[PDB]
Amino acid sequence: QPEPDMITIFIGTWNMGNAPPPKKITSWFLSKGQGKTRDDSADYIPHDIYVIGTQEDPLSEKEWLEILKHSLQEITSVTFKTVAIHTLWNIRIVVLAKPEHENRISHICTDNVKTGIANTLGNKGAVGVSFMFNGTSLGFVNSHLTSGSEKKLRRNQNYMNILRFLALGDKKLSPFNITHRFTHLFWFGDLNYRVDLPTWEAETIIQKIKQQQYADLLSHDQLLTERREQKVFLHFEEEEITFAPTYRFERLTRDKYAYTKQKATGMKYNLPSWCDRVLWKSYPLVHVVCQSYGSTSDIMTSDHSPVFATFEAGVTSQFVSKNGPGTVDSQGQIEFLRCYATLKTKSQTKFYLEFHSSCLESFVKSQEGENEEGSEGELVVKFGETLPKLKPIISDPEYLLDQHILISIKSSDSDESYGEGCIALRLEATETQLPIYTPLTHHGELTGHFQGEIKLQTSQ
Numbered sequence: 001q002p003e004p005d006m007i008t009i010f011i012g013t014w015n016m017g018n019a020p021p022p023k024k025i026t027s028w029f030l031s032k033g034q035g036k037t038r039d040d041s042a043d044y045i046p047h048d049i050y051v052i053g054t055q056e057d058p059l060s061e062k063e064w065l066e067i068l069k070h071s072l073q074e075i076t077s078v079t080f081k082t083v084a085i086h087t088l089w090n091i092r093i094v095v096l097a098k099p100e101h102e103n104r105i106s107h108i109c110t111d112n113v114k115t116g117i118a119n120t121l122g123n124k125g126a127v128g129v130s131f132m133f134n135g136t137s138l139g140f141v142n143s144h145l146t147s148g149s150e151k152k153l154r155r156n157q158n159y160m161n162i163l164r165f166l167a168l169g170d171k172k173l174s175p176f177n178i179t180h181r182f183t184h185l186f187w188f189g190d191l192n193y194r195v196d197l198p199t200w201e202a203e204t205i206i207q208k209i210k211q212q213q214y215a216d217l218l219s220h221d222q223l224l225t226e227r228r229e230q231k232v233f234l235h236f237e238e239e240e241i242t243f244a245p246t247y248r249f250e251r252l253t254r255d256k257y258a259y260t261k262q263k264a265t266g267m268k269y270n271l272p273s274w275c276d277r278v279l280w281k282s283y284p285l286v287h288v289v290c291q292s293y294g295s296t297s298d299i300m301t302s303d304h305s306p307v308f309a310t311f312e313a314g315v316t317s318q319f320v321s322k323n324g325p326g327t328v329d330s331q332g333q334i335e336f337l338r339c340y341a342t343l344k345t346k347s348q349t350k351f352y353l354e355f356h357s358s359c360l361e362s363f364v365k366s367q368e369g370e371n372e373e374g375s376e377g378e379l380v381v382k383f384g385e386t387l388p389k390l391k392p393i394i395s396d397p398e399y400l401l402d403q404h405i406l407i408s409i410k411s412s413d414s415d416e417s418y419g420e421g422c423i424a425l426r427l428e429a430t431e432t433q434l435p436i437y438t439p440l441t442h443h444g445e446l447t448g449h450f451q452g453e454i455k456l457q458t459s460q
């Protein structure tokens with residue numbers, strides 16, 4: 001029974017509005033409704049993994065698990081296994097997998113982050129799950145960010161707190177936050193970004209939605225504009241939105257957007273918005289393709305509609321050779337030529353690199369680089385031909401070309417990371433000097449760049 005090189009992953013996000021679900025929610029898991037929808041010919045084909053994020057979820061874990069499992073069994077005739085479930089307040093994540101994957105999944109981690117302080121601590125935050133699927137690390141974050149049209153900067157702060165403090169994946173990757181720990185990271189939820197148009201334009205917006213003319217609304221979506229200005233979700237992807245705003249609906253129909261200010265809303269307007277989103281970040285040159293992104297039309301218990309997204313994702317096998325794991329394979333090596341980091345810092349410490357990868361027995365520290373002044377007032381840290389030659393555990397090109405090297409640039413004075421990035425070993429050639437590049441981030445914000453050349457030797 002061969003190991004897969006691709007799986008499909010379902011991501012759902014639904015703010016349930018503190019109401020129980022209706023009796024049938026199968027349209028969610030079938031990717032049916034509005035937007036990029038899934039072909040009917042696929043309806044009986046199970047996804048490999050289903051990841052369900054809820055917000056304002058009034059159910060117990062038991063109650064929701066029974067609904068989810070019975071839903072999937074009705075669609076697919078497969079009894080899914082529970083990988084993980086984690087709840088913070090009314091924010092919940094469930095991961096389900098096909099039974100054949102049970103002995104492919106390991107290293108399951110869960111965590112949560114509470115956002116805000118005093119007044120604003122007690123209902124917003126995030127839950128997440130990570131695990132290994134054979135040779136591939138997968139991370140999932142469901143966040144409920146701060147509400148309100150005039151709080152986009154609070155949402156951006158909530159995002160940075162969540163990616164700093166959510167503790168998932170391999171704890172040995174100590175310089176790296178969740179935006180670097182996984183082959184594939186999916187981040188979804190009620191992100192609560194709004195369409196920033198004047199309150200007076202509400203009925204005009206409703207008109208546009210009825211005409212399925214979303215362009216002049218999406219051009220004011222706060223998440224798209226904040227991402228374009230590099231204020232949040234740097235280096236994440238989102239499929240194009242082709243479904244109507246998923247908030248704020250009158251319950252029990254989808255015919256009416258309920259936008260006007262009410263005591264129940266704190267006298268705030270809720271113009272129709274794409275609150276409910278799915279984004280992802282995968283390591284460079286790993287296969288990931290969005291195959292659906294949309295909202296359901298027939299689940300109407302909440303003031304939000306559920307959102308679905310599905311992905312093809314590349315995965316790798318748990319490789320054994322006669323040498324590694326448990327030793328190096330001296331037929332393999334990774335060399336860095338002519339490498340330099342460009343950093344936005346004002347600091348004048350010396351810096352060194354750490355190279356982290358599951359193709360190494362343990363991380364590798366470099367010598368300190370040579371600091372120079374860049375012509376536009378930047379710090380350039382030169383490593384020259386000084387970088388340590390990396391010794392992978394396995395030399396087989398079928399394994400090595402699928403790997404990645406995480407790089408942290410650290411202060412010699414404080415040992416704190418000033419920037420993190422990732423290099424793919426999926427090269428155009430072996431035994432050949434080839435350009436490499438990554439942006440560097442810290443706390444998910446841009447801090448610099450790392451560039452140079454690589455020379456990869458495999459057994460072939």
Ligand SMILES: COc1cccc(C(=O)Nc2ccccc2F)c1
Binds near residue numbers: 106
């Ligand atoms: C379906 O694949 C796997 C693979 C490895 C471990 C598990 C697992 O431990 N599941 C579980 C057990 C008790 C409580 C909650 C759970 F989610 C599941």
